[model samples]
Target: TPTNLEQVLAAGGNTVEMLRNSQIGAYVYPVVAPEFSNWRTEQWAWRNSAVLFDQTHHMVDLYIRGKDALKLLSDTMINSPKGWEPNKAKQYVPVTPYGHVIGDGIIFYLAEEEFVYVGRAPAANWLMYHAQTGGYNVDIVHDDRSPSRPMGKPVQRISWRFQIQGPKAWDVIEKLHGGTLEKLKFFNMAEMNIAGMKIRTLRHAPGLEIWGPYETQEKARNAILEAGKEFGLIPVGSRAYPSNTLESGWIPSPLPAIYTGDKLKAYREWLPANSYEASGAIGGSFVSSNIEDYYVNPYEIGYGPFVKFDHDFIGRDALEAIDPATQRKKVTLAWNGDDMAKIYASLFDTEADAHYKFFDLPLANYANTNADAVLDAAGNVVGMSMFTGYSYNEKRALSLATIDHEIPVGTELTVLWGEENGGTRKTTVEPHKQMAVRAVVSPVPYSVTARETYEGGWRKA
Candidate 1:
């Protein structure tokens, strides 16, 4: 019998328990080297000088076309389609019928009716399912993420994605273009010459996300490197790339809220047993028997502004019923330095039976989805710390999180790190104790430069 996600879940026992203990290991950031220079220096470069992020692998890309392409997206996406057109892009977000986040990505308008989605696998999967089942006149294609461990096999994709970012990123970009390049508004797409080859560029949160056919990947990369020499634009590696979300305030991973919802049961059955939803692991101190507790909505994760009622989406009515004033607001949780120091010192203590959870420098997430408990003084979980990492650029450990709307910035909260009993069966875990790290709620885009320069969308709040 062909097994589906729902069927697999039935046999796997508890959904929350199964995922927490799954041996899937860490969410692999495949292909890229860990670092060009030291990760710490690479981390610093994104804020101090500039960074060239090779986004060629580690994310899925899905293409959409046909007469109904626009209709298909406008019908399913929460983003308004009024001004959506060629050379424009959106932080594509979709939710379940019950109003919980399925996933998010960047959807690019390539031509009159052609579009592409670039992001984590889940969103691409969502679009694929809709196009397949909706009876819409749409054709879609998938360029999957590179295998986590190719082991020696050759790998390729339809496109190669890269980002030139940081304070001096514009300088490096202009040099590569051979002249000044107009910086389009956020998510607006344009083209620029890189050593005589015109490449597509998407203006992003103070950086440029560029891509072209995979065949020109090397030429595009080499040209940027040579042109960026005078500006100290270091190429960032996988180790430091994911951690950038910690400073930028984007919650990259939110366990797609599909399990246990009657409305989503069919969607689950359509999901293959081998899918990320079935195989991905969740690691954190926050645990609940009910898997729905792990799910989050667009509002809680900073996509509230993107949601428009003008077009019908899966979660439209449910979202309309919800009150945004009471929903959690996104912020950067600045981890206390002294607490971070204590967590570090425990690792060196030989006499101790165990130490705090291993905090991998730069990026510390251990599973596909991370949801550490954010608690108030009363020990009640007020929020989920969706991502965890240390930022060398800020000299402080930080997490992008959403807390109770009333919790003002600068309010202190405690993050309970590590699993309750040593840890779960995740391959990334080593037996360790938990720590109540103190953190202060701060503004998103923790960097002063980012806060000022990053325009549009959910960050405005």
Candidate 2:
């Protein structure tokens, strides 16, 4: 019944289906409504429903060992680990040796000596490349290959993931697990023994994300369906997460071009020559994205305050040389529909190639390879815009983009829009959560929860 919807197609139905067809045992599908009549029903899935996305299809899985993994990563990424405790995970970056960004994503410090690296997409390669080229005395391997695929005996690739979200997510899951779900926090997880399957219940940041072995998918699925009846655990198709990401103002990695470029050599320089040591470099061939043309070091993009220039870490001297008063800027744009329609209407007449646009999460790798478009201010291109969707629970279209540093909070920017038919349109832009600007400028997830109140109960809205 959920399969026949229309909004799914309008958003990219065919592409979704094709993805589902190619991957084996991987639940790959686009977010599409089966029939036109149930078009808007998909919205419920986005706003209040729960869904799953198989992010492991082509992702890289890194296994880092050795005592220095933590110190090595800290010296490399923009986010500092000065105060991190063990068993904690946070989004981090892998910079080009020269101080430029390579790709950014999540890193879990499972132990003082062991770690797991989750890169953008096509994950295995970057870590592998780093193992082959970098400074840390670590062992990094790409598990998505054949020989390594059969490593030891039962070694396999990162096979599956379930991103269960929405307000009712905990309620639905707890209904199935019979209170086991109650022990899990937003980003804290526990191990679950279900039907003889060992699954890791991960606390995926703000949204409730759970991932486990594909071998036990049936057990997990059955468990979910059996208990989700009362809480309304809707199987969210593809459309759901995008809406959530849009609403939360999450930035995806850059497109492929930026990722595969020689710019990645910049990571070496970001660290001190002596500190920049590693076994080898782990690299890949997926898309790359930069933080527009602006000189936004890792600090500017959600990592500014955390950067400590007091020590001689990589990029420290260079960072000290930059103008602290420069005031670089990033914003979450609220695009206006009237302007979007206008840009779309003009597409039929434009003969020029549209400028490229993408959601660049300077730290995590780009999400989609990259899509090209233009950002205009008063009919002239002022900046490029990428990534837009409904955000959090507010149900408003939101986007992330780099703009002129001096532009005030409400200063308007127009993002060029177009159809596959070349029909052009534009949407006006404004800051995301204007009052929350100070907080938003800091590191991501943008919200932090403490063990105290979180353990007691969720009291804040």
lDDT of 2: 0.43
How much lDDT does each candidate structure score? Answer: 0.88, 0.43
Task: Give the number of the best model, judged by lDDT.
Answer: 1
Clashes of each: 0, 79
Per-candidate TM-scores read 0.95, 0.62
Root-mean-square deviation of every model: 4.7, 13.7
**Candidate 1 structure quality by residue, lDDT tens digits, 1-461:** 43899998989989999999988878989999888888999988888899899999999999899999998888788899997789999888998888888899998999998999989988888888989988989888899999898899999899999999999999999899988999888888999999889899899827799999999999999999988889998899999899988987899999988888787788889999889999899999998999998988889989999989998788899899999999988888888889999888998999999999988888889998998999876677888898999988788899888888987667778889889889898899999999999888788878432211112211113
Q: Which runs in model 2 stand beyond 4 Å of their true positions?
A: 1-43, 121-126, 144-156, 180-186, 192-198, 205-207, 255-296, 305-313, 323-327, 342-382, 389-397, 418-461
Q: In model 1, which residue pairs have backbone atoms overlapping below 3 Å?
A: none
lDDT of 1: 0.88
Write model 2 residue lDDT over 1-461, tens digit each, in one string. 12211222224333222221221221112323222222235445435654443344334557788866776666655566777765567776544433444456667676668877765432234455445566668776444322212224543454455655666666665555555554445446555544456556667513355556556665776677556656655554433434445445444533211222345444222322211021111111111133233223554444456556543354555555656455444456655544433333434445635422222111111223222233332343343344544433433334555544544454444444322322211111111110011111111232221112123321112
Worst 10-residue lDDT window for candidate 1 reads: 451-460
Deviation in Å, model 2, residue 157 alpha carbon? 3.5
Quote the RMSD, in angstroms, for model 1.
4.7
